[PDB]
Amino acid sequence: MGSSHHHHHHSSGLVPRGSHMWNDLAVYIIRCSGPGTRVVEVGAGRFLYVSDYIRKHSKVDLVLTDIKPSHGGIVRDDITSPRMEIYRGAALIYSIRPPAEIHSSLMRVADAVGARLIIKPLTGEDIVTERKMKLVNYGRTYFYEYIAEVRSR
């Protein structure tokens, strides 16, 4: 009895183009994860190109996280005191243009949940962190990834 098919998708799909250098980044993440899992986008805010591109290429549960968003789909939670419950169960966690101060908080989250942390910094600006992350080049775009190792069984 009953129907649990409530199609609520109130969302203005405005995605800035010209993000060719971001395209490969999305594809890279897509290949690392895929459909039937969770991917967390930190620093979504007002730039949802990557996550949208990913969710269109693969029906992966893309979870957007940012403080006080204006877009339907972003988890309106907190990052200065993050809820691990949101990040747990994710296959990959990436951050779009992260400040060189909260990176440490992101690294421990990835390490906790067991997901690959991908940071897209500036072309000529460092993250100012410990030697943990690695510079990777995909297509033409370069970024920093971190493989959070899984706990022993």
PDB file of C-alpha atoms in Angstrom:
ATOM      1  CA  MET A   1       0.000   0.000   0.000  1.00  0.00           C
ATOM      2  CA  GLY A   2       1.050   3.593  -0.551  1.00  0.00           C
ATOM      3  CA  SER A   3       3.688   5.094  -2.799  1.00  0.00           C
ATOM      4  CA  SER A   4       7.061   6.360  -1.610  1.00  0.00           C
ATOM      5  CA  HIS A   5       7.892   7.946  -4.953  1.00  0.00           C
ATOM      6  CA  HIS A   6       8.043  11.632  -4.084  1.00  0.00           C
ATOM      7  CA  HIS A   7       9.957  13.386  -6.842  1.00  0.00           C
ATOM      8  CA  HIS A   8      11.405  16.462  -5.179  1.00  0.00           C
ATOM      9  CA  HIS A   9      14.236  18.039  -7.135  1.00  0.00           C
ATOM     10  CA  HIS A  10      13.794  21.764  -6.563  1.00  0.00           C
ATOM     11  CA  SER A  11      17.125  22.970  -7.889  1.00  0.00           C
ATOM     12  CA  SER A  12      18.231  25.657 -10.321  1.00  0.00           C
ATOM     13  CA  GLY A  13      20.734  23.922 -12.571  1.00  0.00           C
ATOM     14  CA  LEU A  14      23.068  26.793 -13.330  1.00  0.00           C
ATOM     15  CA  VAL A  15      26.541  25.405 -13.889  1.00  0.00           C
ATOM     16  CA  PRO A  16      29.353  27.712 -15.071  1.00  0.00           C
ATOM     17  CA  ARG A  17      31.043  26.451 -18.205  1.00  0.00           C
ATOM     18  CA  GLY A  18      34.584  27.058 -19.400  1.00  0.00           C
ATOM     19  CA  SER A  19      35.648  24.834 -16.535  1.00  0.00           C
ATOM     20  CA  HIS A  20      37.616  22.645 -18.951  1.00  0.00           C
ATOM     21  CA  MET A  21      40.519  22.466 -16.499  1.00  0.00           C
ATOM     22  CA  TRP A  22      38.034  21.159 -13.931  1.00  0.00           C
ATOM     23  CA  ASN A  23      36.527  18.608 -16.326  1.00  0.00           C
ATOM     24  CA  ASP A  24      39.386  16.091 -16.019  1.00  0.00           C
ATOM     25  CA  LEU A  25      39.233  16.471 -12.241  1.00  0.00           C
ATOM     26  CA  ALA A  26      35.623  15.302 -12.224  1.00  0.00           C
ATOM     27  CA  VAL A  27      36.382  12.388 -14.565  1.00  0.00           C
ATOM     28  CA  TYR A  28      39.296  11.347 -12.349  1.00  0.00           C
ATOM     29  CA  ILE A  29      36.991  11.249  -9.315  1.00  0.00           C
ATOM     30  CA  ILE A  30      34.353   9.379 -11.329  1.00  0.00           C
ATOM     31  CA  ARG A  31      36.852   6.664 -12.238  1.00  0.00           C
ATOM     32  CA  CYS A  32      37.994   6.354  -8.633  1.00  0.00           C
ATOM     33  CA  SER A  33      34.445   5.882  -7.352  1.00  0.00           C
ATOM     34  CA  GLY A  34      31.451   5.312  -9.621  1.00  0.00           C
ATOM     35  CA  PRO A  35      27.703   4.679  -9.111  1.00  0.00           C
ATOM     36  CA  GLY A  36      26.434   3.020  -5.943  1.00  0.00           C
ATOM     37  CA  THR A  37      28.423   4.938  -3.353  1.00  0.00           C
ATOM     38  CA  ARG A  38      28.852   8.365  -1.752  1.00  0.00           C
ATOM     39  CA  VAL A  39      31.198  11.161  -2.801  1.00  0.00           C
ATOM     40  CA  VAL A  40      31.626  14.255  -0.643  1.00  0.00           C
ATOM     41  CA  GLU A  41      32.273  17.677  -2.168  1.00  0.00           C
ATOM     42  CA  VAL A  42      33.706  20.089   0.396  1.00  0.00           C
ATOM     43  CA  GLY A  43      33.716  23.780  -0.424  1.00  0.00           C
ATOM     44  CA  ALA A  44      30.863  23.427  -2.892  1.00  0.00           C
ATOM     45  CA  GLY A  45      29.178  26.675  -1.893  1.00  0.00           C
ATOM     46  CA  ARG A  46      28.570  28.500  -5.148  1.00  0.00           C
ATOM     47  CA  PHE A  47      30.501  26.282  -7.575  1.00  0.00           C
ATOM     48  CA  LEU A  48      28.769  22.966  -8.244  1.00  0.00           C
ATOM     49  CA  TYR A  49      30.244  22.099 -11.651  1.00  0.00           C
ATOM     50  CA  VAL A  50      32.372  19.128 -10.602  1.00  0.00           C
ATOM     51  CA  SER A  51      29.742  17.355  -8.505  1.00  0.00           C
ATOM     52  CA  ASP A  52      27.049  18.005 -11.123  1.00  0.00           C
ATOM     53  CA  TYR A  53      29.276  16.686 -13.913  1.00  0.00           C
ATOM     54  CA  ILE A  54      30.006  13.597 -11.816  1.00  0.00           C
ATOM     55  CA  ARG A  55      26.364  12.909 -10.885  1.00  0.00           C
ATOM     56  CA  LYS A  56      25.458  13.211 -14.571  1.00  0.00           C
ATOM     57  CA  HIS A  57      28.176  10.801 -15.677  1.00  0.00           C
ATOM     58  CA  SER A  58      27.475   8.385 -12.851  1.00  0.00           C
ATOM     59  CA  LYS A  59      24.500   7.978 -10.544  1.00  0.00           C
ATOM     60  CA  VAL A  60      26.717   8.312  -7.516  1.00  0.00           C
ATOM     61  CA  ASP A  61      25.353   9.833  -4.315  1.00  0.00           C
ATOM     62  CA  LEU A  62      27.179  13.134  -4.493  1.00  0.00           C
ATOM     63  CA  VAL A  63      26.987  14.884  -1.151  1.00  0.00           C
ATOM     64  CA  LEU A  64      27.711  18.588  -1.222  1.00  0.00           C
ATOM     65  CA  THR A  65      28.885  20.234   1.979  1.00  0.00           C
ATOM     66  CA  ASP A  66      29.206  23.930   2.801  1.00  0.00           C
ATOM     67  CA  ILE A  67      28.082  26.432   5.414  1.00  0.00           C
ATOM     68  CA  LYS A  68      24.749  28.183   4.713  1.00  0.00           C
ATOM     69  CA  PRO A  69      24.275  27.234   1.019  1.00  0.00           C
ATOM     70  CA  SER A  70      21.761  28.795  -1.364  1.00  0.00           C
ATOM     71  CA  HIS A  71      21.432  25.757  -3.612  1.00  0.00           C
ATOM     72  CA  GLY A  72      19.073  22.838  -3.106  1.00  0.00           C
ATOM     73  CA  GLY A  73      21.276  19.815  -2.592  1.00  0.00           C
ATOM     74  CA  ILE A  74      24.092  21.102  -0.417  1.00  0.00           C
ATOM     75  CA  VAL A  75      24.103  19.783   3.142  1.00  0.00           C
ATOM     76  CA  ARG A  76      23.775  22.877   5.286  1.00  0.00           C
ATOM     77  CA  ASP A  77      25.985  21.503   8.037  1.00  0.00           C
ATOM     78  CA  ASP A  78      29.161  22.847   9.641  1.00  0.00           C
ATOM     79  CA  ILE A  79      32.810  22.396   8.672  1.00  0.00           C
ATOM     80  CA  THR A  80      34.520  23.938  11.710  1.00  0.00           C
ATOM     81  CA  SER A  81      32.806  21.230  13.713  1.00  0.00           C
ATOM     82  CA  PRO A  82      32.092  18.622  11.006  1.00  0.00           C
ATOM     83  CA  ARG A  83      29.761  15.673  11.423  1.00  0.00           C
ATOM     84  CA  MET A  84      31.678  12.559  10.403  1.00  0.00           C
ATOM     85  CA  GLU A  85      28.342  10.781   9.913  1.00  0.00           C
ATOM     86  CA  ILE A  86      28.027  12.665   6.622  1.00  0.00           C
ATOM     87  CA  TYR A  87      31.499  11.762   5.362  1.00  0.00           C
ATOM     88  CA  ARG A  88      31.409   8.145   6.510  1.00  0.00           C
ATOM     89  CA  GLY A  89      30.411   5.673   3.853  1.00  0.00           C
ATOM     90  CA  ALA A  90      31.937   7.852   1.162  1.00  0.00           C
ATOM     91  CA  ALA A  91      34.363   6.445  -1.386  1.00  0.00           C
ATOM     92  CA  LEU A  92      36.026   9.769  -2.139  1.00  0.00           C
ATOM     93  CA  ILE A  93      36.141  13.247  -0.609  1.00  0.00           C
ATOM     94  CA  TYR A  94      37.347  16.292  -2.525  1.00  0.00           C
ATOM     95  CA  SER A  95      37.517  20.015  -1.864  1.00  0.00           C
ATOM     96  CA  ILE A  96      37.013  22.822  -4.364  1.00  0.00           C
ATOM     97  CA  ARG A  97      39.482  25.640  -3.635  1.00  0.00           C
ATOM     98  CA  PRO A  98      40.147  24.958   0.087  1.00  0.00           C
ATOM     99  CA  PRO A  99      41.698  27.624   2.363  1.00  0.00           C
ATOM    100  CA  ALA A 100      45.260  26.823   3.457  1.00  0.00           C
ATOM    101  CA  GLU A 101      44.132  26.501   7.070  1.00  0.00           C
ATOM    102  CA  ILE A 102      41.274  23.971   7.189  1.00  0.00           C
ATOM    103  CA  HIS A 103      43.124  21.425   5.050  1.00  0.00           C
ATOM    104  CA  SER A 104      44.234  19.624   8.212  1.00  0.00           C
ATOM    105  CA  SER A 105      40.610  19.042   9.209  1.00  0.00           C
ATOM    106  CA  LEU A 106      39.920  17.594   5.771  1.00  0.00           C
ATOM    107  CA  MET A 107      42.892  15.234   5.869  1.00  0.00           C
ATOM    108  CA  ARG A 108      41.817  13.619   9.143  1.00  0.00           C
ATOM    109  CA  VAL A 109      38.283  13.175   7.802  1.00  0.00           C
ATOM    110  CA  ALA A 110      39.477  11.276   4.746  1.00  0.00           C
ATOM    111  CA  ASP A 111      41.788   9.192   6.926  1.00  0.00           C
ATOM    112  CA  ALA A 112      38.916   8.464   9.306  1.00  0.00           C
ATOM    113  CA  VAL A 113      36.369   7.358   6.708  1.00  0.00           C
ATOM    114  CA  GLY A 114      38.833   5.698   4.349  1.00  0.00           C
ATOM    115  CA  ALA A 115      38.294   7.817   1.264  1.00  0.00           C
ATOM    116  CA  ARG A 116      40.631   9.460  -1.223  1.00  0.00           C
ATOM    117  CA  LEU A 117      41.053  13.148  -0.427  1.00  0.00           C
ATOM    118  CA  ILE A 118      41.428  15.346  -3.496  1.00  0.00           C
ATOM    119  CA  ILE A 119      42.333  19.012  -3.187  1.00  0.00           C
ATOM    120  CA  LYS A 120      42.376  21.438  -6.095  1.00  0.00           C
ATOM    121  CA  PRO A 121      44.650  24.327  -5.004  1.00  0.00           C
ATOM    122  CA  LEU A 122      46.024  27.307  -6.908  1.00  0.00           C
ATOM    123  CA  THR A 123      48.425  27.070  -9.844  1.00  0.00           C
ATOM    124  CA  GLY A 124      51.100  28.905  -7.895  1.00  0.00           C
ATOM    125  CA  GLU A 125      50.007  28.541  -4.290  1.00  0.00           C
ATOM    126  CA  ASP A 126      50.860  25.781  -1.818  1.00  0.00           C
ATOM    127  CA  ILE A 127      48.556  24.160   0.748  1.00  0.00           C
ATOM    128  CA  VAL A 128      51.028  24.749   3.588  1.00  0.00           C
ATOM    129  CA  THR A 129      50.710  21.309   5.125  1.00  0.00           C
ATOM    130  CA  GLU A 130      52.859  18.344   6.103  1.00  0.00           C
ATOM    131  CA  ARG A 131      54.362  16.137   3.396  1.00  0.00           C
ATOM    132  CA  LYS A 132      51.387  13.812   3.132  1.00  0.00           C
ATOM    133  CA  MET A 133      49.591  14.701  -0.093  1.00  0.00           C
ATOM    134  CA  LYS A 134      50.808  13.995  -3.603  1.00  0.00           C
ATOM    135  CA  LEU A 135      50.678  16.126  -6.744  1.00  0.00           C
ATOM    136  CA  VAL A 136      48.837  14.303  -9.522  1.00  0.00           C
ATOM    137  CA  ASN A 137      48.366  15.248 -13.165  1.00  0.00           C
ATOM    138  CA  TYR A 138      45.272  14.122 -15.040  1.00  0.00           C
ATOM    139  CA  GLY A 139      44.900  15.134 -18.657  1.00  0.00           C
ATOM    140  CA  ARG A 140      46.160  18.667 -18.318  1.00  0.00           C
ATOM    141  CA  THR A 141      45.026  19.598 -14.821  1.00  0.00           C
ATOM    142  CA  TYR A 142      47.094  18.979 -11.699  1.00  0.00           C
ATOM    143  CA  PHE A 143      45.888  18.644  -8.126  1.00  0.00           C
ATOM    144  CA  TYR A 144      46.683  16.987  -4.809  1.00  0.00           C
ATOM    145  CA  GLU A 145      45.316  13.600  -3.826  1.00  0.00           C
ATOM    146  CA  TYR A 146      45.676  11.584  -0.645  1.00  0.00           C
ATOM    147  CA  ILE A 147      44.908   7.896  -0.349  1.00  0.00           C
ATOM    148  CA  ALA A 148      43.418   7.316   3.078  1.00  0.00           C
ATOM    149  CA  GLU A 149      44.427   3.796   4.016  1.00  0.00           C
ATOM    150  CA  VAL A 150      41.871   1.388   5.430  1.00  0.00           C
ATOM    151  CA  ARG A 151      42.128   0.005   8.967  1.00  0.00           C
ATOM    152  CA  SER A 152      43.381  -3.534   9.541  1.00  0.00           C
ATOM    153  CA  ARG A 153      40.649  -6.162   9.698  1.00  0.00           C
TER     154      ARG A 153
END
